[PDB]
Every structure is written in structure tokens, then in C-alpha cells.
Symmetry: D2
Subunit: 337 residues, 4 copies
């Protein structure tokens, strides 16, 4: 059959996932939705022409015997509650970041999932499904460059809104690097340090931008991550991994080249939504296919959600202290190995 | 509803389209199949776990009131017959190349389609859906380089089988360039000339490889197309369009870069099936979506099939004559404008 | 000692060579000059602060026992006369293109040089000394790509003056490709054909621009050379050699890259004089060093001058006829092997 | 006349400069040499066929009224003595790094030079004369990217000898970055911190390799410099400057590209001596031309030597302490502005 999916939270993110499941992907259907604003959920069912029940809350949606799996796409601080309820209802769950707002909240989810005996929770770190990152992972797993030693990366954005604050550089922005890098190199984070260059003219007075975040792993890999969210020129993700015997680097997004007016050039995307559309499609298709074929999910795990929560909190601490701060992680359970 | 598709011809190509419709794309289902070898069609229904009727021939399949659209993926010389039957049965049809084996056969299809009053026929020239070609088309349509003047392109393949013959360099290989280029520049072909370099050591004695094909358009654009099907190093498509004021060029397929052992490098694909998988997915999704949203197809047309048939025949003539040969095209009907 | 050089022709080209010998290179000095306009030669001696005698003509300059070698940098049609006189006077001679205006004139020079028993004549085809071309030659000589099969090249210039005529596309412009390519692949030219695309809006009404020149070698290498002298965007030399097993390509001139305003770009030079300055320096330094160390010159030869004269004439014939034209070359003497 | 140069120290470095002055450059001659090993100096005069006097020491060489300028190319710790003697003898001096082994020694030279009233001392930081760095400087001076904010750079070498020690990563290797970067951005260094990744398998047990050096300028520019001297793959210099509105990056050294065996690649040099040969030539030619045309030198100054000495010492301190260390610089004299 089609995997029958319910959606908890019908804002921009939920709508985009509803659109991809309904109009782009294979093997699933939206059969149920809920939102805090019931009127909004009804509008969504109408706009996307869904054959779906509108439920007043997640408890009633999760009680629907004909819902197999849910997307948790509500307000971030509301995610944890729905994830816990879904685990208890024994539904598969795809949770947009964050899994929970604290390490403790992630640990509550971890404890309950481990009881189930199979993986129900996939966290929405879509970078792992981007073709460039998949290529990097394959090269590393094949020992192409020997042991990784250093990672140099950048997350650049053209401009941010007036409400974007210093902490969000790590909470909303660097969190993607935080998830993908430890996955690439199969190592755990140990410490973080934040350094502030000269503030850019393109940043509002309350915002510290750019920033450099230096992260060391337990194995001794050193990551230097630049975050510059008012770079003006484009939305740009760059990542180079220096190994003992060679160096691998993430590609530019594909663009025709142009020779014109004394310049040889390619395009730089301006819109972050154009950068990872394929990865979002693949991540959800993987959720669907893994469930149908394996009876459990296969992507970033609740434990990856925990690592992101602990590490982001340490980075925010380091933003304030100017000192090297410890990333204190519990031992990874065999369940998540 | 799901668009209900029947498949005529369940060989490798038909199977791959069945796989994408069943497991990758949105909005369609395989409800019927037929193959000359009925046992093969039954095996296909079983292998892909289809809920589909096996019909003994295309006439019976096309008589099924619950088939909305068909794929024609049979032996090439058999395509024309099924396309004509499908038009008469008023079904939408996606036809793999060729539309027909002769200009005359394509004209028979054109005459019958024009009677219908809407487009039923989409021909499987998937290059138009490749992101690089879409980018080229957008640049041209926006006048980025002024008038196109010259096109330099190459279609390279690592090695061919013992049964690949000189004519197939244009019939099976260059036909893709033949379709995409006139579309890019909105011009008609007027003449073709073939020049043979030194034969490669990598080619079998009966095969002329490489070849250069020089094509001139009515507007005066000159295309120099290299075909080298035993290039050894990779499967490689290259295309540069020189305009009055600048030059645009198709990108390399996306690859991580590597610094190792004194070389800075990216990957070249070895497998043509890895080069255009995304384009095949997009072309079929467009077939489905166009039908459901517009009630007619929107891709390469029966007329494009005709242009390909006329032009390939002229190229094969030029391969034999060593002279400049005319491409004689009827006026394009308003139906296809 | 310093090699004592006399200069015959003190126009722009002669002045630039005088400047490089006097202010940039090692091991030579300008001791004598002559120009048709004696006042101009005197001004040159003063402007460059030379310790040099001004002679009324080349005969008197060549009679100076203390002149070891001469540069022939006069009006093109005047070159042949001075080269012949210098050979008879037993001086080494560096001759700017052309060696002579006709195949017959080049053959007169060849006959007289062969009598000398050592190479006196170096022709000013500086591309052979450009680092990119040297790299191409090394790769070819090391069999990196197997046998060369095809060459795709372009010679592009931003705009030309009102006096630039169709024939000059081959006589003044393509002549550089004509010299360098047969050297790269160690093959002789056999035929040429000219094809005219759509005329560019950037070309004046009397000029055919762009042009494509197709040249076949005796060994069966096919060269497609684009000439576009009003391309607007830059001065740009491109060259790709397709071999049996791989492909080599001339590099872009070195430029920093820029990410800015949605584009990732490098520089394209606008000024042809910036493209080959290093090659001009190296070619003259080689003239000097070869003479001092070997007692004979080592660069492009009088025979290379002959090949250029024959081939340019065939191309101009082909420009007019629209037909394939023969390049008729005498057998290369052992003297020039 | 030719600038008459004496050479103090005829080892490998002195010999290479003698070779370039004698056989490659314009306007100077080697008229005098001295070495601690007089037999070595005599051999050098013979090997290079110099018309030069061999002096027993630098005092006697500097007393030669017919010596205009000297190269100081002796053992590093011996440089300071000869530079001071040359300033007192009122000769122009080109000094290979280091200017002196301590900040105090550099300050002694600075004090004596300032008395002269014109610049006599040029320090051999050749990177400033490399075409890529010149291009970076021009872009910065033209405000192409707005204010520089961050610099990401790497100095990589394939392997080092058994005698290469941890301190040399900054003293001999990073010193080049240390000189060029403050010049590029016209800012002073304020602090340095060293971080050690996982040790490479390619490094001997006594050596800490790779290393990351984080340098902050007074203006707030943050530099992250990777040093990896056993990277195996090549000798490789990389440098990216992130500005407010865009990013500029040093180019790869020019190389033909190759498509072969499934890879599209360019060359990475293995030999550091091939990386900067042009810069060494240009730096010495500039020394010669500046003296002859301006009567004083124009390259990196004694003050730049001082900055390098102070900064290298701070980096070595940071290598040992693991803490952020201050770079304590005296105010730059107007003499050196
Ligand atoms: Cl919270
Ligand atoms: Cl965009
Ligand atoms: Cl999980
Ligand atoms: Cl614990
Ligand atoms: Cl047929
Ligand atoms: Cl492949
Ligand atoms: Cl059609
Ligand atoms: Cl007609
Ligand atoms: Cl003449
Ligand atoms: Cl320029
Ligand atoms: Cl010669
Ligand atoms: Cl003969
Ligand atoms: Cl010392
Ligand atoms: Cl090398
Ligand atoms: Cl100084
Ligand atoms: Cl002080
Ligand atoms: Mg853009
Ligand atoms: Mg590969
Ligand atoms: Mg420019
Ligand atoms: Mg190499």
C-alpha cells in the first residue's frame, strides 16, 4: 500500500513536505493533519487537495489506527512532545530539527526509543542526502585520503532579517555542519571555541557576524567553520577535508559557465531553498522506502539529534565565554551503532 | 486519480520506465502491459509487483477503457505502428526514440495527430530535461550572449560492442544532439557534412570512429559535432555555444574534487546510464503532470521526431558520400509552433 | 661577451624587442639600428639610451663586422630582402612573421640557408615558447593521450579596427595556430576548407567574421579552428587536443578568482599584448642563448616560415572558393629535421 | 652602467641568485664574492665564469669602491652582521630571510638604516612578487570585496627531511605567509594561537605536523593558517581572503588539463623550487631597477624583517604554550610608511 502519513504542524515546512509527498515522491499519502490553528490545517487540506482528516491535536491524530507514520513539523520547542507521543503510539516519525531543545529532552526520546527495539525516529538533517556529501562520505569510507586530519568549511548566506540573533548562527545555521561532519568522519566532538573577526558592515548592530567556530574531535580532527550570514554575494556551502595523503572538497552546485565582458564565470545561488531541494526529496523518499522495505527508518537518528543538541549548546556557551568549552556526550548506545 | 498507464514493450527500456513510475515518481500507475513475448510481460508484472493486466497485443491494450496513456518502448522499428494506434484510440503516448524509422512514417503520425486538435505524442528526447541544458536554454532565451553563431559539441563514450556500426554514430548516438540543438537555438537544420579523422586504435576494423559532423542551420549557425564512441577515458557530453557577445557552456556533472599524488581532479562518469538518470525522471514526471494539469503533453513533439528522422537520414547519407547533403524539411505546422 | 645585435626596422615591434633586450633579458646588446625613416631610428636610439650606430640601410648595417646577429622587424613585405642579405653576410637572424610573403620567397631563403650548413634563421612564432603550449608538447611527446586524432581551437579577439579585412583572419591571426599545431603533433598539413557562420553584429559590413577553418593533416588529424575577431568579451586562445585515450587542453591564463554578486569568476584578458609577453621574452632569450651556447639558432625555422606561407595562402584561396583546397608542400629537407 | 653586485655567502641560495643575475636578468653583474670557505667561493667564480674578485671576508668586499650593492646569502644567523656592515658602508643590500634572528637584531638594523635617510635594505620575501599575490593586492587596493574580514590559507609540502623540527613550521615555512598577509591587508598582527590536529602518519615521531595557526590583526582580521609539511600529494600554496562583499582566492599554478582514465585533472607541483621561480626573478630585477631608477630599494623592508622576526617568535612561543600569545610590535616609523 501507500504509507499513510499524518502531519503535525502545517506551517511553511509542513506544507513543503506535504507538497513533495503528494506531488513529487512515490509510495506515501497524507491521510491526516493537525495544527494548533485548526483553520490553517483545514486551508492546507483544501489547498493541496488532500484526502485527509483534520484532527484537533496530535493525541487524536496518533490514535488513528490508519496512520502509519508522522511528520513533526510544528514550532521547534513543540517537537519533543509529539515525538514522545508518536514513539509511545508506535508510529514511525520524521522530525524536523530540533529533535528537542535540550540534551535532556533528546535523552528522554532516546530512552523511550531504545525500549521499542527498532528505529522509529528519523531527524531531518538533509545534508547527509545531498549528492556532494554522499560523494565525500564514499571517498572517506574507501580510505581515498587516509585518515582525516582537518576540516575547513563555510556556511555563507547573503543577508538575514532583523530578528536573526548571534546564537542563531549556531542553533539554526551551523547545526547542519554540526550534524554532517561527525557523520562524515565517524568521530565524536570534544571541544568548541568561538572567535569573532571584525564585524561586517552588512550585519545589524546587535549581531556578531561573521564568526569562526573551531571544533576538535576526540580523535584529534580539527574543524574550522566559518559562519557568515551577511556575505552579500550568495548562499554558499563550502567544505574541504584534509587527510594524511590527499584532500577532498564539496563541489559547486552545477551551473553553465559564461564568458562575457572580460569574465569567465559560473552561478552562485542566492536562495538557500534552491541549494538543497534534491536532498529534501531524497531524505523523505528514504524515510518512506526504509519503512516499507525494512520496517524501520535509516537516516539521522535520535542519537544524532542528541549530539546536535549538546554541541549547539556548547557552541552558544563558547560564543559567550570566549573560552574553549567541552562537549560532554554520553556513550553512544549499541542501539544507535 | 493516478494517471493509468499501459506499457507496450517490456524490455530493458520499458522496465526502467516501469520502475521509475512505480517506485520514484508521483501521480501514475502501471495498469496494463504487453510484449511480443507474453511470458516476458508476465515476468515483468511479477518482478515489479504490478497490479496490471497482461494483454496479448497493443490493440487489446489500447481497447482498455481504463488505460489513459501509453509508453511505447518496443523494438524501434515497431514504434510507429503503436503510436498510430494510440492516436486513433485517443490515448496520450510517450514514445521512446525513434518516433518512426523514416521521415514518411513520422509524417503519417504528424497527419493523424493534427486531426486530434491537441498534443497526444511526446517523444523521449530526455536531454531537454537535463538541468544543464535547461540552464543553456534559459540563457539563450534571455539573450545573455546575443545571437548564437556557432556550436561546438562532443558526444564521447568509452567503448562500444562488436555490433556497433558506423551509421549508429548518428542514428543512436548523435540523434540526441540532433534533437537538443535546434531546440536550444530555435532554428532549422539546412545541411550536413561528415569528416573522418584518423581511425582510433580503440575502434574495431569495421567502424569509422571518431567522426566529425558539421551541421549548418537556416539562420547560419554552424555546429561542429565530434562523435567518439571509443574514447576510453569516460562517457562525456560537452557543449559550447558561441554567441555574438559571449559564450555559454554545459557543466561537468557534479563531482567532489581530489588533490592526491600530484593531481587535482574531478570524476568523469564511465556509465551513460549515470549521466542522465535525473533527466529521464523529470521527462516522465512532466508527461504525467502535463496530462493531468493541461490535458495534453508538453515535451518534444511528433514534429521533433520528424526533424530527428530527416536529419539522421541526411547524416547517414553524408557518411557515405563525403559531400555536403541537404536536410529537406517540410514547413512546421502551426499545430507544433 | 654580449651578443651584439642590430635591428632592421624600428617601428612598434622593433622597439618592443629593443626594450626587452635592453631592459629585461640577459646576454645581448643593441649596437646598431636602421629604419627607412632615419629620423625615427635616431629617436629610438635616444629614447632607449642605446650605445648604437644608426645606419642608413641594412646593407651598411650588415657590413658592420661587430654585428653578430640581427632582428628583422621592418614592414612585412620587406622582411625577405633583409633575411637574404643577412644569410649572405653570415649573421644570425631573428625574423618577425612573415619570413616572406610567398612560398617562393620562403624557398629562396631556404635554399640559401641550406648552403650555410648551420641554422641562422629563427622565425618569430612565439606561441611555441608559451608555457601552456610547452606543456601540451611535453604531454604529446610522452604519449600521454596516445595518437592525436582531432584538434579543436579558437582564436578570439574583442574587436578589430576598420582596416581589418577577411584575409587577415588567416594571414595575421590564424597564422599563429597554423605554425603551432603542426609542431605540436609532428604532422604536415594536406587540405583546408573555410565555412562561414552567420555574420556577427560586431563585425563591420566588409568583414566575414566569425569563420571556421577545417584543416586536415597527412596523418589524418582533423583541426577545427574558430576565428572570431569581434567576440566582444575578451582576447582568448583555446586549444583542445583529442587523442585516442585522453584529451589535453591549454589552460586559462592565471587569474585570482572572485565570488561576488552571485557569480564565481576569473579574469579574461582584453589585451593580446598581455597574453604572450612571457613567450616573447623567452623566444628572444632562446635566440641569444642558443647562439652563444650552440653557435646556431634553435627555434621555429625557415622551413616553418615556408609552411606558414603555403598554408596561409591555401586558406585565403579557400576563403574565396568555398571548396576544399590542397596545401602543397615540398618535402622537408634533412637540414630542417 | 651595470649595477655592480657583491655576494656574501656562496652556498645554494647565493649560487641561484648569481645564476639569475648572470644568465637571466638585466642591468647587473657579479663583480665580487666572499664565503667563509674561500675555496667554495673560488669554485663558484669558476663554475659561473664570473669576472669577479674573491674576498676573504665581507669587510674587505664592502671596502671595494666598485661594489654598489650586495646580496646577503650566508648562513641565516650570520645575516645581521653583514647587513649592518653594508649599511655603514652605504651599499644597497638584498638580504635573504631572516634579516636577523631576533627582534632586537632587526631593531639594530632599523636604527642604522633610518640614519641613512633612504632605503638601502630589501628583504627576500619573494611572495610579494608572485603574480597571484600581486593580483590579490590589486583587488584589495581597489576595494573589490570591501573590508577584509578573514583569511584562510595553507602551506603544504609533500615531505620533509629527518632534521625538520616543529619550530621550523613557523620559522622556515609559515614565515612566508607571515610576511605576505599583513602586506596584503595593510594591518598589524596582534595575537597568535597554535592548535595541533591529530599527527599525520607521514610525519616522523619528533615532529608535530600538521598545525593550525590562528592569527588576529589589530583591525580584527582573523587568519587561519594550515601548515602541513608531509601532505604527500604535492607542494601547494592556497589563500582565500573573505571580505564584506565578496571573496578572492589565489590561483592554481598554470597547468594543462587532462581527461584520462575516468578523471579530469590538472597538475600539482611537487617541487617548491618550481612554484616561485618567476617571483625570485622579479624580486631581484626589482632590486636592480629600483636602485638604478630611484636610488633606493622598493621591496619588503627592514621593518618587514622586524615584523617577521617578532611574529615568528610569538608563534614558536604559542607552539609551546598552547595559549594565545601577544605579538608586541613597536610603532612603525614614518621612514617605513
Ligand atoms: Cl524549550
Ligand atoms: Cl538563486
Ligand atoms: Cl532514531
Ligand atoms: Cl552516564
Ligand atoms: Cl523500418
Ligand atoms: Cl561511473
Ligand atoms: Cl506531438
Ligand atoms: Cl510540402
Ligand atoms: Cl609581396
Ligand atoms: Cl587586460
Ligand atoms: Cl632556419
Ligand atoms: Cl619538388
Ligand atoms: Cl642567533
Ligand atoms: Cl614538479
Ligand atoms: Cl628597508
Ligand atoms: Cl617603544
Ligand atoms: Mg544567478
Ligand atoms: Mg570514477
Ligand atoms: Mg579584467
Ligand atoms: Mg606532475
Amino acid at each position: 500500500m501507500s504509507l499513510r502519513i499524518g502531519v503535525i504542524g502545517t506551517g511553511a515546512i509542513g506544507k513543503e513536505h506535504i507538497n513533495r509527498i503528494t506531488n513529487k515522491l512515490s509510495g506515501a499519502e497524507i491521510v491526516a493533519v493537525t495544527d494548533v490553528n485548526q483553520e490553517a490545517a483545514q486551508k492546507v487540506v483544501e489547498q493541496y487537495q488532500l484526502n485527509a482528516t483534520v484532527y484537533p491535536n496530535d493525541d487524536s491524530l496518533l490514535a488513528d489506527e490508519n496512520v502509519d507514520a508522522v511528520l513533526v513539523t510544528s514550532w521547534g520547542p513543540a517537537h519533543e512532545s509529539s515525538v514522545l507521543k508518536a514513539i509511545k503510539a508506535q508510529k514511525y516519525v520524521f522530525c524536523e530539527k530540533p529533535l528537542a531543545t535540550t540534551a535532556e529532552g533528546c535523552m528522554r526520546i532516546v530512552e523511550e526509543e531504545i525500549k521499542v527495539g527498532k528505529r522509529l525516529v528519523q531527524v531531518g538533517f538533509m545534508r547527509r542526502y545531498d549528492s556532494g556529501y554522499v560523494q565525500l562520505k564514499e571517498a572517506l569510507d574507501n580510505h581515498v585520503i587516509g585518515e582525516p586530519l582537518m576540516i575547513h568549511c563555510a556556511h555563507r548566506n547573503p543577508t538575514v532579517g532583523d530578528n536573526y540573533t548571534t546564537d542563531m548562527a549556531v542553533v539554526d545555521t551551523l547545526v547542519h555542519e554540526i550534524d554532517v561532519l561527525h557523520w562524515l568522519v565517524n568521530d565524536d566532538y570534544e571541544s568548541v571555541q568561538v572567535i569573532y573577526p571584525k564585524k561586517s558592515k552588512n550585519a545589524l548592530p546587535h549581531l556578531k557576524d561573521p564568526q569562526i567556530v573551531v571544533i576538535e574531535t576526540k580523535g584529534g580532527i580539527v574543524i574550522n567553520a566559518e559562519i557568515y550570514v551577511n556575505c552579500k554575494y550568495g548562499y554558499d556551502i563550502q567544505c574541504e577535508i584534509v587527510g594524511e595523503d590527499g584532500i577532498i572538497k564539496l563541489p559547486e552546485p552545477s551551473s553553465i559557465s559564461l564568458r562575457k565582458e572580460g569574465r569567465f564565470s559560473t552561478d552562485i545561488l542566492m536562495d538557500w531553498q534552491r541549494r538543497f531541494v534534491a536532498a529534501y526529496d531524497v531524505e523523505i523518499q528514504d524515510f518512506i522506502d526504509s519503512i516499507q522495505k525494512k520496517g524501520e527508518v535509516s537516516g539521522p537518528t535520535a542519537w544524532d539529534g542528541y549530539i546536535a543538541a549538546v554541541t549547539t549548546d556548547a557552541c552558544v556557551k563558547a560564543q559567550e565565554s570566549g573560552q574553549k568549552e567541552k562537549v560532554e556526550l554520553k556513550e553512544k548506545p549499541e542501539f544507535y551503532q
